[PDB]
Amino acid sequence: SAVKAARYGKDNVRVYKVHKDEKTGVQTVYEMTVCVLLEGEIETSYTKADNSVIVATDSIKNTIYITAKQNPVTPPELFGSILGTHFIEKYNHIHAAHVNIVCHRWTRMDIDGKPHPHSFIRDSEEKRNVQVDVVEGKGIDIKSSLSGLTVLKSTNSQFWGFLRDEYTTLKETWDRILSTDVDATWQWKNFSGLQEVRSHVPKFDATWATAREVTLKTFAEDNSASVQATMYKMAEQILARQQLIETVEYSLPNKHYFEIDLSWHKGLQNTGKNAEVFAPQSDPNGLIKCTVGRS
Amino acid sequence: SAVKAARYGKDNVRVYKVHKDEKTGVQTVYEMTVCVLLEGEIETSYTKADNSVIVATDSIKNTIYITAKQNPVTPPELFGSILGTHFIEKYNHIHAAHVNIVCHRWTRMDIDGKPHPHSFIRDSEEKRNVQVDVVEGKGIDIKSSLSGLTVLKSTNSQFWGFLRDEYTTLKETWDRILSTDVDATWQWKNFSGLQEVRSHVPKFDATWATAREVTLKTFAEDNSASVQATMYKMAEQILARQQLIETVEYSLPNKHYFEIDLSWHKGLQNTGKNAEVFAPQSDPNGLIKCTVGRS
Amino acid sequence: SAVKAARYGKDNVRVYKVHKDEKTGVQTVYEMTVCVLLEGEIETSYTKADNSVIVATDSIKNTIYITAKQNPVTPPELFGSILGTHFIEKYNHIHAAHVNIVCHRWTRMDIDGKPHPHSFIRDSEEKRNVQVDVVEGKGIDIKSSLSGLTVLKSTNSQFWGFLRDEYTTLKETWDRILSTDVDATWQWKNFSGLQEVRSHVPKFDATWATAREVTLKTFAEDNSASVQATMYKMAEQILARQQLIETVEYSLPNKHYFEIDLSWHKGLQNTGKNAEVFAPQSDPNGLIKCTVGRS
Amino acid sequence: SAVKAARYGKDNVRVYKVHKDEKTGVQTVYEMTVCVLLEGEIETSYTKADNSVIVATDSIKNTIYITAKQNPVTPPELFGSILGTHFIEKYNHIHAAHVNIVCHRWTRMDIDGKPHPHSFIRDSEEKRNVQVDVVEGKGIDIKSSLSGLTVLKSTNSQFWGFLRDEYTTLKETWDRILSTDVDATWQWKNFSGLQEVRSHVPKFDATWATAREVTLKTFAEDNSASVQATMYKMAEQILARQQLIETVEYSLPNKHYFEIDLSWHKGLQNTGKNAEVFAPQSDPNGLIKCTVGRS
Ligand SMILES: O=c1[nH]c(=O)c2nn[nH]c2[nH]1
Ligand SMILES: O=c1[nH]c(=O)c2nn[nH]c2[nH]1
Ligand SMILES: O=c1[nH]c(=O)c2nn[nH]c2[nH]1
Ligand SMILES: O=c1[nH]c(=O)c2nn[nH]c2[nH]1
Ligand SMILES: [Cl-]
Ligand SMILES: [Cl-]
Ligand SMILES: [Cl-]
Ligand SMILES: [Cl-]
Ligand code: NA
Ligand code: NA
Ligand code: NA
Ligand code: NA
16 A cells, blocks of 8 residues: 555644734734645655654644744735745755635724724624645645625525426525525635735735625625526626636525415415515525636 | 423524515515423323323424514514413413524625615624513513624733632733623513513613623723623623613623743744734633622 | 622633553543532622632632542542532632533443453543532532433334314324433432532442433333323433432423425325335424422 | 536435334334535526526435435445436436435444334444545446544553654653544445446445444554554555555544643642643644555
């Protein structure tokens, strides 16, 4: 037998960093969860019990904190690229670093209509994520994403004209609830290294904001023919607004809300045009995915 | 042996309701999770296999949907009271109903600076809850709460002057991070029945809003001497603003963020006044509770 | 306003302890999660910012580790009682300690049909728990429990003869699936203090084992008329086998598995006597509780 | 823009099936969670709102139940292959089906030392999984796995001789606790279609059993030089015992248990040879992966 692939490192490293403006007294906090996995000439640790090739995962953890101390942690695309580059440059035998970062929301509180200098609220479990793969001699590949954005519209969703055969019981509909948890990923063109990533720094936050805005507006305004059709419209617009993105991927559950027939009870009318009370279904759920790239 | 206490019913009943304004086209959604447990002269179902006394839990589920169809579901204090009253009035042998409701956030989306008629976002896992106990001949007891409100302040929290003995290693501090998940409950004076609950309907939403506002403002503005001292200030203010509340209870975890000494690495300074990077601790956590009532 | 009730301490303290037999080389591990909350003359920490009355929660954490180092951690009833007694004896102004312990399973592995000296498996998320309340001048109250024991029987459960009215759609049945997660609690007679708890030490593990055995056998053998009837039989037997128990409480979800009518598809028969494929329902669920004491 | 990849279907479909032996009265239950995603000539549903190409996800759900009714559901490798083949054969424009199955444990209860005919216990959250990809003209690729197998050994694990530099604080050790949650996947050689999968049916359960046994024995018996070295030994043995496996992948967290220095308290000795009480760490954790194939 032979080692075909191997990677190892530290997962679930929670990091918080505060920035304090001495002039204004304003403080800004960042909190993330980081995973770093390394690859390289490490097969002998598996096959020969040769630990001399292992950068201990505890050391990887230390490196994450030290790197956060000495560098900006925002945008996460930049931080991930600095962190990944560190490992391939520092260690001759390490040839790839894979860095995943999940950014947690700490939103500045408004008290009496003004922004508070040092108090924050977690407004939702929505995350902003990055995956950065730094591969020696092959540059830096970055996938940025948002996840956990949960939305619902109560009308202006339809689903009719699908294939009907002997396995089909679903009725066509011209008015239904549509609700999903959005997972959207945009993949950047390959960057040659850290200098190039630095040169594009302003684009990272702007593109995240654009992706979020396009998702929300399209969802709210589309008279949706299906999840498939609506998500394609979102992806199309993101690609149009940022030329440095190569592909956009959406993965969307269709979280069903079922009508409840109450007619058995005193002829109560609660279906079709009369539907007011529905039963949200925890499972099963549709799952719809697509990856959109350029012609 | 004898049955000393017994209650039974249906838990985890998910309900969604939509209200459609025909005039304006504006739609408003409510989503809740409901639990109803009944008590009464039901001991023989346990001791003699006498099912004749059992209102099936499936029927309780049906009743929740039917009641939501025929009544407003907001404020949840009113809905819970209608639902609980139903069971004690409908069934001679049922003498208490215990209704718990968890309200999930569906916040209207703003698209291009205007409120959208029918699209909603889940902004945070914060809940608004009620517990309603309807007891035949003893009225209606209502406890209202908010939970899952997660906040952090990066300075203006202190903790010094605590007991020091041979079990103590904790250093006194004049500047630390304070972060918690707020669980706050206000208990209403007993109501004689549904007519009295109806008479106070406007107070329910207003008091929820006040409790939230007082919590957030006090947390942000208090130069906190301890979690204990800050939470007492919150409870005091809520009791002052609503005379129909008898007690306020807060239950607050102290979610610790630890300094990381980096001095072992090139004399890097990251403690005390130089602390910028911290390690959030998933566990253990302080847990601080208090119930405040009137003199 | 006044402080009506207050308690504070440390939650989610994870503890592992190993015992090493030097003679046989056999090692035995225990892992628990502990919560300790104190009450006493501590109101001034809330009302006057007087921290002098606070035993820091960090010190409580230290005390848990020190106590585990110097005492047996099994049975958990004994450990909880030692830990709770410590606080009320050590601190003049602390008058009650509330200790909750969750014991996690680490079951010795059998390799090649023999017990391994130092390797363990987590066989299920079933827990053994204790709640110990040590109140100065009022002794020690102990509630022991098992939770997270998930079982299913595929036949020999019935449910018919329940109340039918205009809210009822449920069909009577003489053969259904019954599945639940068992939560069972037995409450001990009050103990005068640690000496008395020590005197009964062998009864704690034996009663846990009896409670588990009675639960499993009764569930498997009862031709169940309802969850209510079956759970009463369990509680009755536990009370009969251990005179030092005052009450037994069961709390049982009824986790529903629904028939799926497939007759719309080529007349396929999958209901009643022909039912083979079912849809487990994640929610809602019945919830049935009872507390059984002595005549 | 263009659709580069697309797949859609139904996730989280819970299925239970019972087999009843009329002769012996013995009943056997299977419970699974199934996900089916399809690919094919479906781009127009995204780009042109053409639903005519969509097999509704609700129909996919129906198909899962119908298929379970008419076929064995064990071993899951066979069931997944039948289910996947169905879609590519039934629908001309569907060219790949991706089926994931998670099998939940329902273990027959022993009551009074004998196997009960119809009562079952969930002994642990360990799962047996399959991923089956059925691709028209390219056969059937099957990856089988076990996951959620949580183990701990209290000694006979070492970690020394790793790289030490200015980022390293970890001390070498010759005796530590090792605990992990095992995720192991074995990938079968490609099968030409359902006939070939049927021909190997007995190998599926046997190989699962072998993989489990090898994992447990190796973990318990290896005087481990590292997670890397121990996991390689496991993978090597599995490949040796089943020639129809091409690769074995392990993904193992290193769940840390830290010594607690108690010497600050009355010189109490709890480190090194004197370590008895440890603090399990919820995070961060090492994560070690490897894929082993044939020379
Ligand atoms: O077994 C281990 N492997 C590793 O790579 C490692 N790094 N720190 N501790 C460790 N233990
Ligand atoms: O065992 C049961 N008890 C109940 O109270 C009930 N209600 N619906 N189904 C039921 N099954
Ligand atoms: O605010 C606090 N209250 C407490 O009781 C405590 N104990 N340790 N740290 C603490 N912080
Ligand atoms: O938007 C939808 N897309 C689908 O593929 C589907 N299938 N059932 N319902 C559906 N809704
Ligand atoms: Cl769907
Ligand atoms: Cl605390
Ligand atoms: Cl029920
Ligand atoms: Cl590790
Ligand atoms: Na390198
Ligand atoms: Na009544
Ligand atoms: Na005392
Ligand atoms: Na096909």
